[PDB]
């Protein structure tokens, strides 16, 4: 009858195997939010609003991201499953491969972009000690270092981000000090220096910060399937569990991204550049070789706390989980970091900036259909047995659910009627159409299964 798709890497993650509680998850989100993108974003916003408003658009954009997390993360915590595996539910066991390929492409692209910034940094550090300046060699060596620390999966991420967090927070508070002092300006003064060219709606501002988390929010499964759960909660104890985790991510990502957003904005407004390295250099009138090396140790420490967890984890699990007898987790990581780099993406980001903003916001229906299938349609009632099997209640028409790929198409179109909010309209649209679409497919294929009684077999302790 049915081929088995289970292997030790892509198997649900047992209660006894879980290792990330609520404080640690905040400490991962604190180090995961400090990274280049937010200097650029918050810097360019000072053109349309003043610095204090940029801080508010950031806190607001941070908060909408968490309300979405509360919903997209809930199934992964309870049942210990993948992103790639969980998509099998609404789209087919094979039909899921379409949107997931969309998503694995973004992730792989950005992995090579950030691998690049890391290389620039190590390369700046070496030639400021040796005049030696080879970049392509330093690219590879870094791609390589990340791969080897990612082999330890969430064990490394979590220990590395907990020790990085405080170092980064201090390197950052010193940074604000060097600036304010050297420009001779109080904090309150800089807080209103922007916004001399209004025009952009404040709503579209918030949407620019949320649009930086999208791809991570649409697939946290790959991190949070590792969080601690009490199997014996209730509808209401499970809900507080969901809420306690969403709260931990909030206290982690807000104060981190508010402090560093402010640094990017201040640079623009004091000196005309979003990059604090340059801006502090001017304001202070040159700096010693040590304190320079510092700036570069920072950039490197900030990339390592973001790249692996956000960009490399998820294509790894897609490989070892679609070709389960061909790839394993450790092996999928090696193939992803290689494909990522042979796209040599650091040369098309300039061009493609606008193309990629489209591809990202075209995951709105993907997030919308998955929240709806699991919460509204199935009522949290799922069958692990069938997710790991070629022929079961998730096979639909020969592996693909054409009605769901249709709800996807229709919703992406409706999405275009509202360009500055594309992502959020497509999600809301996909969410609502899936309901009637799914009560129709259900007349032909069943929505629940008997084998769902083996669910606890996958998780509980063996002996
Ligand atoms: Hg944010
Ligand atoms: Na980081």
XYZ file of C-alpha atoms and ligand atoms in Angstrom:
465
model
C 0.000 0.000 0.000
C 1.702 3.164 1.297
C 5.367 4.204 1.305
C 6.717 5.511 4.661
C 8.110 9.086 4.791
C 9.435 8.990 8.392
C 13.127 9.048 9.276
C 14.866 9.981 12.563
C 15.546 13.633 11.580
C 12.016 14.441 10.319
C 10.158 12.657 13.159
C 7.996 14.545 15.668
C 10.029 15.781 18.617
C 9.337 13.941 21.859
C 8.187 15.606 25.122
C 11.240 14.262 26.846
C 13.427 15.596 24.008
C 12.313 19.267 24.405
C 14.863 21.886 25.570
C 13.728 25.508 25.054
C 11.575 27.134 27.731
C 10.180 30.690 27.849
C 13.227 32.710 29.077
C 15.502 31.090 26.537
C 13.149 31.783 23.642
C 13.167 35.496 24.512
C 16.982 35.329 24.576
C 17.027 33.827 21.110
C 14.637 36.499 19.767
C 16.731 39.260 21.311
C 19.854 38.134 19.475
C 17.905 37.136 16.288
C 16.422 40.666 15.863
C 19.754 42.565 15.988
C 20.905 42.499 12.380
C 21.620 44.879 9.494
C 18.152 45.028 7.903
C 16.843 47.206 10.779
C 19.570 49.813 10.499
C 18.568 50.259 6.856
C 14.830 50.180 7.409
C 14.669 52.532 10.400
C 17.218 54.839 8.786
C 15.283 55.415 5.561
C 12.025 55.930 7.527
C 13.364 59.184 9.089
C 12.763 60.687 5.667
C 8.976 60.334 6.173
C 8.484 60.557 9.953
C 10.531 61.773 12.874
C 12.757 59.455 14.966
C 10.277 59.054 17.859
C 7.597 57.985 15.362
C 10.042 55.476 13.831
C 10.441 53.968 17.314
C 6.627 53.742 17.523
C 6.227 52.146 14.066
C 8.838 49.602 15.209
C 7.142 48.718 18.543
C 3.833 48.513 16.625
C 5.289 46.417 13.813
C 6.881 44.183 16.462
C 3.510 43.670 18.137
C 1.551 42.680 15.010
C 4.297 40.087 14.349
C 3.627 38.433 17.759
C -0.210 38.256 17.343
C 0.581 36.318 14.128
C 3.085 34.085 15.994
C 0.508 33.217 18.663
C -1.409 31.495 15.821
C 1.202 30.093 13.390
C 3.293 28.505 16.170
C 0.614 26.712 18.146
C 0.555 23.352 16.296
C 4.339 22.997 16.277
C 4.616 23.413 20.053
C 1.877 20.857 20.808
C 2.811 18.153 18.247
C 6.529 18.693 17.746
C 6.344 18.886 13.898
C 8.195 20.548 10.929
C 7.041 23.364 8.733
C 7.504 21.278 5.568
C 5.624 18.323 7.120
C 2.754 20.449 8.556
C 1.947 21.941 5.113
C 0.922 18.469 3.947
C -2.307 19.079 5.770
C -4.192 21.726 3.726
C -2.232 21.422 0.458
C -1.431 17.832 -0.480
C 1.296 15.507 0.737
C 2.853 16.486 -2.636
C 0.855 19.620 -3.510
C 2.480 21.303 -0.518
C 5.743 21.172 -2.484
C 4.587 24.192 -4.608
C 4.276 26.987 -1.978
C 7.064 25.393 0.098
C 9.402 25.713 -2.892
C 8.441 29.360 -3.060
C 9.500 29.728 0.576
C 12.682 27.645 0.476
C 13.857 29.992 -2.349
C 13.645 33.220 -0.326
C 15.339 31.551 2.635
C 18.218 30.216 0.528
C 18.710 33.611 -1.129
C 18.955 35.556 2.122
C 21.272 32.921 3.601
C 23.921 33.851 0.963
C 23.382 37.573 1.377
C 24.102 37.448 5.110
C 26.945 34.983 4.604
C 28.412 37.829 2.578
C 28.136 40.531 5.301
C 29.797 38.119 7.674
C 32.674 37.663 5.209
C 33.115 41.427 4.717
C 33.478 41.658 8.474
C 36.052 38.917 8.999
C 37.874 40.255 5.958
C 37.941 43.795 7.365
C 39.232 42.361 10.642
C 42.106 40.486 8.985
C 43.340 43.267 6.716
C 43.289 45.678 9.687
C 45.900 43.299 11.145
C 47.752 42.165 8.063
C 46.826 44.158 4.950
C 45.754 40.767 3.498
C 42.415 41.180 1.682
C 40.892 38.101 0.076
C 37.095 38.109 0.166
C 35.987 35.016 -1.832
C 38.125 32.806 0.430
C 36.512 34.475 3.498
C 33.022 33.938 2.077
C 33.511 30.142 1.870
C 35.307 29.875 5.243
C 32.251 31.605 6.836
C 29.560 29.620 4.987
C 31.559 26.715 6.351
C 31.701 27.925 9.983
C 27.925 28.394 10.042
C 27.302 24.932 8.606
C 29.402 23.303 11.341
C 27.744 25.212 14.198
C 24.315 24.473 12.696
C 24.988 20.690 12.868
C 24.292 21.111 16.604
C 20.795 22.299 15.672
C 18.976 24.226 18.365
C 21.592 23.346 21.060
C 24.143 25.772 19.630
C 21.685 28.496 18.558
C 20.362 28.635 22.099
C 23.661 28.722 23.928
C 25.259 31.115 21.443
C 22.345 33.597 21.588
C 22.222 33.615 25.382
C 25.888 34.580 25.626
C 25.664 36.964 22.644
C 22.629 38.810 23.994
C 24.263 40.828 26.832
C 27.503 41.475 24.897
C 25.421 42.890 21.998
C 23.243 44.969 24.371
C 26.373 46.586 25.880
C 28.232 47.056 22.602
C 25.018 48.851 21.630
C 24.545 51.138 24.650
C 28.205 52.197 24.328
C 27.424 52.963 20.623
C 24.620 55.434 21.468
C 27.013 57.034 23.972
C 29.860 57.570 21.471
C 27.325 59.263 19.125
C 25.230 61.515 21.398
C 28.329 62.762 23.172
C 30.412 63.377 20.045
C 27.611 65.262 18.314
C 26.807 67.169 21.524
C 23.110 66.388 21.455
C 20.712 65.166 24.150
C 18.574 62.061 23.650
C 15.327 64.071 23.604
C 16.607 66.364 20.852
C 17.476 63.584 18.418
C 14.062 62.119 19.176
C 12.474 64.772 16.908
C 15.029 65.447 14.148
C 13.291 63.669 11.271
C 10.311 63.842 8.970
C 10.724 66.739 6.549
C 9.144 65.075 3.561
C 5.826 63.502 4.675
C 3.633 61.476 2.279
C 3.885 57.822 3.326
C 0.907 56.619 5.395
C 1.820 55.494 8.922
C 0.114 52.132 8.226
C 2.464 51.435 5.339
C 5.346 52.197 7.658
C 4.342 49.521 10.160
C 3.957 47.143 7.232
C 7.595 47.743 6.302
C 8.866 46.490 9.652
C 6.510 43.464 9.844
C 7.532 42.550 6.334
C 10.951 41.787 7.706
C 9.721 39.009 9.956
C 7.253 37.477 7.452
C 9.322 34.463 6.313
C 10.313 33.594 9.905
C 6.732 33.953 11.188
C 5.318 31.792 8.431
C 7.685 28.955 9.428
C 8.690 29.181 13.117
C 7.765 25.485 13.398
C 11.407 24.720 12.736
C 12.468 26.450 16.006
C 9.482 26.122 18.288
C 8.736 22.414 17.752
C 11.514 22.309 20.343
C 9.696 24.272 23.105
C 8.551 22.753 26.382
C 4.962 21.505 26.601
C 2.824 19.796 29.266
C 0.943 17.113 27.277
C -1.773 17.131 29.999
C -2.940 20.709 29.690
C -6.484 21.508 28.553
C -8.056 23.760 25.953
C -7.461 26.551 28.475
C -4.072 25.522 29.811
C -2.854 25.045 26.230
C -3.979 28.584 25.510
C -2.003 30.060 28.382
C 0.961 28.010 27.073
C 0.594 29.621 23.659
C 0.277 33.069 25.307
C 3.295 32.659 27.612
C 5.500 31.847 24.594
C 4.164 34.732 22.440
C 4.814 37.005 25.437
C 8.406 35.768 25.740
C 9.102 36.568 22.089
C 7.689 40.040 22.565
C 9.933 40.993 25.507
C 12.811 39.658 23.457
C 12.271 41.409 20.090
C 10.886 44.843 21.113
C 13.659 46.288 23.374
C 16.302 44.802 21.072
C 14.887 46.201 17.856
C 13.886 49.567 19.411
C 17.462 50.239 20.646
C 19.015 49.280 17.289
C 16.316 50.898 15.162
C 17.094 54.095 17.063
C 20.813 53.726 16.209
C 20.037 53.404 12.481
C 17.669 56.389 12.551
C 20.135 58.576 14.539
C 22.918 57.901 12.020
C 20.676 59.071 9.106
C 19.618 62.228 10.885
C 22.906 63.299 12.504
C 25.229 62.558 9.607
C 23.280 61.408 6.561
C 24.193 57.654 6.592
C 22.169 54.656 8.028
C 25.333 52.708 8.912
C 26.599 53.430 12.471
C 30.181 52.435 11.598
C 30.532 55.477 9.291
C 28.325 57.779 11.335
C 30.334 57.272 14.532
C 33.614 57.626 12.669
C 32.738 61.145 11.462
C 31.092 62.432 14.631
C 34.145 61.385 16.664
C 36.794 62.261 14.101
C 38.581 58.970 13.451
C 39.155 55.930 15.679
C 41.942 53.628 16.984
C 42.639 50.212 15.379
C 41.267 48.313 18.414
C 37.916 50.205 18.590
C 37.556 49.553 14.868
C 38.096 45.805 15.161
C 35.388 46.055 17.869
C 32.842 47.469 15.368
C 33.643 44.507 13.125
C 33.429 41.864 15.901
C 29.938 43.330 16.493
C 28.677 42.935 12.895
C 29.960 39.322 12.892
C 28.409 38.512 16.253
C 25.136 40.013 14.951
C 25.035 37.877 11.773
C 25.785 34.583 13.492
C 22.843 35.099 15.859
C 20.456 35.537 12.922
C 21.523 33.746 9.715
C 21.563 30.046 10.852
C 18.318 30.136 12.774
C 16.346 32.250 10.275
C 17.727 31.139 6.889
C 19.440 27.718 7.017
C 17.354 25.575 9.399
C 14.300 25.612 7.151
C 15.692 24.471 3.895
C 17.597 21.722 5.757
C 14.344 20.211 7.122
C 12.669 20.568 3.676
C 15.366 18.375 2.095
C 15.713 15.662 4.723
C 11.950 15.558 4.869
C 10.924 15.429 1.168
C 13.682 12.949 0.166
C 13.805 11.097 3.454
C 15.938 8.091 2.353
C 18.295 10.388 0.366
C 19.003 13.251 2.884
C 19.312 13.632 6.624
C 19.222 16.846 8.680
C 23.016 17.190 8.862
C 23.273 16.445 5.135
C 20.448 18.849 4.107
C 22.249 21.670 5.878
C 25.377 21.067 3.727
C 23.390 21.067 0.460
C 21.439 24.235 1.440
C 24.422 26.348 2.346
C 25.992 25.340 -0.992
C 22.987 26.078 -3.224
C 22.511 29.329 -1.268
C 26.021 30.508 -2.186
C 25.978 29.418 -5.850
C 23.083 31.858 -6.354
C 25.765 34.429 -5.534
C 22.832 36.587 -4.274
C 24.955 39.553 -3.134
C 24.888 40.712 -6.753
C 21.123 40.650 -7.448
C 19.746 42.118 -4.208
C 20.322 45.594 -5.643
C 18.424 44.787 -8.835
C 15.921 42.401 -7.287
C 15.023 44.357 -4.151
C 11.491 44.961 -5.555
C 10.997 41.412 -6.887
C 11.788 39.904 -3.445
C 9.431 42.226 -1.577
C 6.764 40.697 -3.820
C 7.761 37.087 -3.228
C 7.747 37.667 0.527
C 4.369 39.307 0.724
C 2.994 36.450 -1.484
C 3.131 34.184 1.583
C 0.110 35.916 3.055
C -2.244 33.232 1.753
C 0.218 30.528 2.844
C 0.008 31.738 6.456
C -3.724 32.281 6.055
C -4.569 28.839 4.781
C -2.464 27.082 7.420
C -3.923 28.990 10.357
C -7.401 28.189 9.018
C -6.950 24.503 8.192
C -5.591 23.796 11.711
C -7.725 26.131 13.951
C -11.070 26.489 12.138
C -11.515 23.552 9.717
C -9.950 20.596 11.645
C -10.435 21.997 15.133
C -6.908 21.090 16.169
C -7.698 17.474 15.385
C -4.864 16.045 13.287
C -3.410 12.644 12.345
C 0.363 12.285 12.647
C 0.015 8.759 11.217
C -1.128 10.128 7.883
C 1.371 13.025 7.615
C 4.182 10.534 7.392
C 2.553 8.264 4.832
C 2.137 8.533 1.069
C -1.503 7.243 1.000
C -3.774 8.478 3.789
C -6.259 11.218 4.640
C -3.880 13.940 3.251
C -3.264 12.470 -0.215
C -6.320 13.995 -1.944
C -6.074 13.756 -5.753
C -2.922 11.694 -6.242
C -0.966 13.778 -3.687
C -2.275 17.291 -4.441
C -5.265 19.293 -3.211
C -6.211 21.354 -6.266
C -9.031 23.177 -4.449
C -6.431 24.580 -1.933
C -3.973 25.679 -4.682
C -7.072 27.344 -6.125
C -7.914 29.219 -2.899
C -4.250 30.240 -3.016
C -4.496 31.706 -6.584
C -7.788 33.551 -6.026
C -6.430 35.128 -2.794
C -3.123 36.308 -4.339
C -5.155 38.171 -7.014
C -7.569 39.854 -4.539
C -4.283 40.706 -2.743
C -3.256 43.101 -5.572
C -6.184 45.446 -5.032
C -4.308 46.728 -1.959
C -0.507 47.151 -2.738
C 0.782 48.801 0.477
C -0.783 45.996 2.570
C -0.455 43.012 0.135
C 0.670 40.395 2.738
C -2.127 41.154 5.226
C -4.927 41.180 2.629
C -3.866 37.856 1.086
C -3.737 36.219 4.517
C -7.212 37.500 5.490
C -8.556 36.469 2.061
C -6.997 32.972 2.078
C -8.128 32.409 5.640
C -11.798 33.138 4.794
C -12.085 31.283 1.422
C -10.457 28.068 2.752
C -13.500 27.445 4.957
C -16.170 26.936 2.225
C -13.562 25.475 -0.127
C -12.726 22.852 2.524
C -16.316 21.936 3.379
C -16.614 21.074 -0.303
C -13.520 18.877 -0.717
C -14.768 17.140 2.458
C -17.682 15.594 0.546
C -15.119 13.632 -1.448
C -12.234 13.103 1.012
C -12.365 12.622 4.778
C -11.129 15.316 7.214
C -10.317 12.990 10.135
C -8.835 9.526 10.557
C -8.891 6.499 12.824
C -5.094 6.273 12.936
C -5.163 9.510 14.864
C -5.242 7.422 17.999
C -1.545 6.604 17.530
C -0.607 10.330 17.973
C 0.707 9.941 21.491
C 2.781 6.975 20.367
C 4.957 9.433 18.386
C 5.609 11.663 21.413
C 5.347 9.863 24.754
C 8.376 8.037 26.272
C 9.368 4.611 24.903
C 10.264 1.563 27.025
Hg 10.011 44.343 14.961
Na 21.968 38.691 15.165
